[PDB]
Write a protein that binds this ligand. Structure first.
Ligand SMILES: C=[S@@](CC[C@@H](N)C(=O)O)C[C@H]1O[C@@H](n2ccc(=O)[nH]c2=O)[C@H](O)[C@@H]1O
Ligand SMILES: C=[S@@](CC[C@@H](N)C(=O)O)C[C@H]1O[C@@H](n2ccc(=O)[nH]c2=O)[C@H](O)[C@@H]1O
Ligand SMILES: C=[S@@](CC[C@H](N)C(=O)O)C[C@H]1O[C@@H](n2ccc(=O)[nH]c2=O)[C@H](O)[C@@H]1O
Ligand SMILES: C=[S@@](CC[C@H](N)C(=O)O)C[C@H]1O[C@@H](n2ccc(=O)[nH]c2=O)[C@H](O)[C@@H]1O
Lengths: 380, 381, 380, 381
């Protein structure tokens, strides 16, 4: 009665993930000077090139050349020997204003709290008690592996490391009345950009002893665990040189790594008025509140908004059968505790502050200091 | 209760993100029309007056990017500045290089075809549901066919005021039925389509209701409580790349199951078969559909996982939502004895070197005949 | 005892000339909000693309998308049927700050009037009495032909006209003790972008009767004058579609059309602190002052500045033999009347005002309302 | 008096504007190495991390722009981020299209080669002076040879602290001599050359004076009053495309006569022979030099003019500054009976289809042997 499941994650240097950070760094820059800034900023990253295309209406003056390179600096690409240098790369800006047709039917002369929607409902939110982060173990480990890599690369423990990295974790599960119990780690994949000096033997030894065994609890690792460490063999070429990078091409890494469901919208580069991001954060907030409240062990929340309606038009709770209360009993507790109007979400989750660059790497969900990761004490 | 609402969306050929998906696959076809073993990883960016090609391509084939890109834009129908974009005078930048030698020496070099390792890692999903003849969710089927009808009436001349950029949403009320789902009624549908300036909003919403909606949605699903948001934002004169920075792979959920099932994150357009983000996802749909069409289940989800350079998949999973007599473990045995999911053999099983990918870059990759992953395989068990 | 000479000129729609106007429009934008703005803005114009590359340190906030398209609008490219549309073209901005090495050894903590130079001398200035504009007849006519074309295109007299145009005028001269006497027009060339409707016969008739005979004095035209009107035949494809355009690729059109001499520097996109532009305008100012003062009929002025010197290091006057006073008598009158320090030129020629977009077409020299075209009343 | 100062400048291979001139001519060679009848109008743009190709090219020839551009950058010597630019990781955008069909149907289509009309209108000049052996002004000769010596010592390793970007000015005191000019003494010379960080300014100015200046300028021209501005602006660590937006054709005076004679405005690099901006200017130098080298005058200037589509030049002019026994009209008769200035015959007379143009893209196009327009033609009169 077992099954497998697999999730992936990337490091700060992945060309797609570089764009997510640059797009949200641009967003943080405008929100710092203009909390009411409308930002829709995409980023393209190819060899020696960072392009900013999109639409922005803001009272803020932003040094885009500075913001981009400071973001590329923090990721760690600072020399030609690594494939990309924040000091000498090309930065192109093709940013205009928010499209005049999109501005009139969404914002301009609205009363914040009673804005309904210019769009539809979709929007999913997921939570599970298999980890204390209330996230699937597959992606929690996948995120933490890339973070340990960047941790050891910056302090000089493994100076041969380079920013671009990808991981993948397969966990063997067992069903337990809708809930899933992780029993062991089946397969681990690690591919990281490296120096020209270190040999393939020293890397795989370090990836297993200083990274994997430092991140994965030993109770999940046994003699049958499969390790694909540097399976491509060579990996000195990385970053925007090895693959074209685009904002919003890791949305499954950004969310639940395959678990739950996804509507389609990407997060990075969009301010709070994009219901693609604010309501996605809110559904996770509700989902985590239910599991940590003891009202279920697994849950999937879907919030079906409508256009000319501020409140949610339909909330359906899928608890997979992990609750004593029915999937409609929890509905009463949801609306008794949560106000999921879009304009009210920004007030409760404090979505006007510039915190979005920190979300554009290692997952928007499951990490400590985020408003939507602190469960709300439910009253019922 | 047992009832719930579900929503899926779709976009027209003129939507900026689908322009990139279509141009990237037009480039993929041109390299496959000369070099079937092309290694294409083309990404397209679309903004005001600019189409940008970026990525890595290695193929013994000469293609005119300026001509291929502009021929696609012409097909979509942006041919004048009054429509916001014109193929004749738009800027076309090319930042294409060769494929990374580090990736090439660990994916497809020196190996015979049946052992070509995965072009990258990642996870892919396959889904199928008995609620439609084409084994697809009704929400995404109706949303796709709405945009397709819009383009049909625009091109033949029935509604000559239509422009290529369009977007639809379909909300359907469902009922949980022993693990499967039963579509009851269409709750709300939304249609925003680009138009010229000299056609009034009354005539558009009148034609949107009678000539496309009622010509696509079966009458039993519509009643007199379904909400019609026809041209809701207001006026839609400015469309195409002028109003949204479009990128390749920003509509992966539209391309697949409209929110049903699951997604692994991989995009389809601009990638050849060696990228398992596309070929393994096409095989998963082929597996899921042949399961449902074979009577083994009514609703099924199938997952695969790969590693960069490894031929065999890392994992396979089967979930049947409880819509089957057999167990999920038994269904996993039936598929492993019937299918071969290595990215070398999937090519032969699906004819994935033929330049027929630009067709798939709109109205969904799944649920339409002419595609080899849509003709089910007779299982043996 | 005769000879020929030929000059060319272009219209507002020439891809190279489009960039000159865009570069100086950017410059005018910064100078309007910051008179002390340092601008070095190049412009590239290809099919559907306008790229801004360069370096700018300024307190001004400039809408580059607006400034570019307003410039493309005024030139007249406003539809896809013309090859270029200000409404739908691509605008890319790759502008940084003035290079930190270039800023310290030129400006930053200087006293304006007593700045010497970060560069050398060169810089030529020319004047001739063959026209009342004090310019060579070859280029005065070449400029005026393109202007009549744009004049008739805007008022609808010739609606089939399009912005891109090139002209060329060959004048037969006769030497007169160093001075040159124009006697007749030898050869005229006109190539203008046109409609798809008008035939090749109607264009050539209009170019000769409504343009040439309206611009050229009839005393210079006879039955032997050679006309190459639309010699390429077809010209519906023009603007940045037919040829890549770059700032500063018509510097001979910008100055004297072959007469005199040139140092090399282009004008458009550079503020007043670039001695390539300010001193070139000043040499013409002195040159015109000498001829209009009656001190010579033709003159070429060369001002050889030095690095650590504010005043000119050496002024040499070449009057071709058209003066009763020696080429060193005029030197005394020059320094008795002109103060050619670079910081003093901006004060006398009022070079901080945003007037540079008007100079980036039809010639920087020889046109009425410019400070360096009003001769100074000389005292001696 | 009769004396005056004159100044000319030159720039190194690493100067941004000359990088574009060199890359555009590297592209021209690659198309001529396969299709001699190429129609190249390549323009290059260089900025921080970006090389942009833009223009119009029609040639039955496949060239790797990513490789050709980066091979040129490697030759110039920008190979690390510590130098401000690196060919291995720089961005290379390509906006090249086909040549305008309206230009092609009125320049070179269907005509046999001897009647190929001018690729454009314009005016071109040719100059020659007896003040040097190579028939060039001393100011521009010395400025060119200074940059060339800098590159010589940088590449062999004599001064391994040199970087590619450099710029020189040479001011020379002259004397008017019966119409010609006599160089008396070098008044001032200026040298700004890019350098690394760990070499002090004393060692640089010491080497700039003794190892390049005194190795290039004849001793009689230098005395103890010549002003030496060696590294005058201060520090020059940041150079190359990072500190100046470079464009093709922004150094036309450096390419020609350093301010002597005159210029018509046409740039040279990136253009094939059908563009008379280059081929007719090469012929004018060939005419002017063979006049001076033939003893007919000491200083001469020659002008030509063309029209788009007309084979024969519109006008030719001769000015000898009064340095000849014969009249300017008689010199115009001698050249018209000896030379053929149609852009179809100039090709055969100068071997202008051979890919030898990248060599000319630096240190001046005139005044150096190996070039056919520098070997004079024995006149007949
Ligand atoms: C395979 S990459 C995209 C494929 C496409 N660039 C191609 O034409 O092959 C996606 C990610 O796969 C990582 N990778 C791993 C091992 C390797 O040898 N080279 C790599 O590029 C890298 O992080 C990249 O973002
Ligand atoms: C010949 S154009 C540059 C040549 C280069 N584009 C080529 O690959 O041939 C320079 C100018 O020559 C004008 N011209 C005239 C007639 C014609 O039929 N087509 C044209 O492009 C136009 O103004 C252009 O700026
Ligand atoms: C959701 S839109 C994203 C645009 C971007 N986020 C922005 O805010 O600037 C993309 C689609 O939203 C449709 N749309 C509808 C009404 C309108 O006034 N303007 C529009 O752009 C149009 O189909 C477009 O492809
Ligand atoms: C005259 S520079 C034009 C730069 C541009 N006008 C600007 O102001 O940003 C181009 C050349 O000026 C040299 N130079 C010298 C000293 C210095 O501190 N910085 C420099 O860029 C260098 O050779 C460069 O190629």
């Amino acid at each position: 009665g077992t099954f497998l499941f697999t999730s992936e994650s990337v490091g700060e240097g992945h060309p797609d993930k570089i764009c997510d950070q640059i797009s949200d760094a641009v967003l943080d820059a405008h929100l710092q000077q203009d909390p009411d800034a409308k930002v829709a900023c995409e980023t393209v990253a190819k060899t020696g090139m960072i392009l900013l295309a999109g639409e922005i209406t803001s009272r803020a003056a932003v040094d885009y050349q500075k913001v981009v390179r400071e973001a590329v600096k923090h990721i760690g690409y600072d020399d030609s020997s690594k494939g990309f240098d924040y000091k000498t790369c090309n930065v192109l800006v093709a940013l205009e204003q928010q499209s005049p047709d999109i501005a009139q039917g969404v914002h301009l002369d609205r009363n914040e709290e009673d804005i309904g929607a210019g769009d539809q409902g979709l929007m999913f939110g997921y939570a599970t008690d298999e980890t204390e982060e209330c996230m699937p173990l597959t992606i929690v480990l996948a995120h933490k592996l890339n973070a340990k890599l960047a941790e050891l690369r910056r302090n000089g423990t493994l100076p041969w490391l380079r920013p671009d990295s990808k991981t993948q974790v397969t966990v063997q599960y067992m069903q337990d009345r809708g809930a899933v119990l992780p029993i062991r780690v089946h397969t681990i994949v690690i591919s990281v950009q490296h120096d020209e000096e270190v040999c393939l033997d020293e890397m795989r030894d370090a990836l297993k002893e200083k990274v994997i065994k430092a991140v994965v609890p030993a109770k999940y690792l046994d003699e049958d665990t499969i390790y694909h460490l540097q399976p491509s063999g060579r990996f000195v070429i990385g970053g925007p040189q090895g693959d074209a990078g685009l904002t919003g091409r890791k949305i499954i890494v950004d969310t639940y790594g395959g678990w739950g469901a996804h509507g389609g919208g990407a997060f990075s580069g969009k301010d709070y008025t994009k219901v693609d991001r604010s309501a996605a954060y809110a559904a996770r907030w509700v989902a985590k509140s239910l599991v940590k409240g003891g009202l279920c062990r697994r849950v999937l929340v879907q919030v079906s908004y409508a256009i000319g309606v501020s409140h949610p038009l339909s909330i359906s709770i899928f608890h997979y059968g992990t609750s004593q209360k029915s999937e409609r009993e929890l509905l009463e507790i949801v609306k008794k505790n949560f106000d999921l109007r879009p304009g009210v979400i920004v007030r409760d989750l404090d979505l006007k502050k510039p915190i979005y660059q920190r979300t554009a790497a290692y997952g928007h969900f499951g990490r400590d200091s985020f408003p939507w990761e602190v469960p709300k004490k439910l009253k019922y």
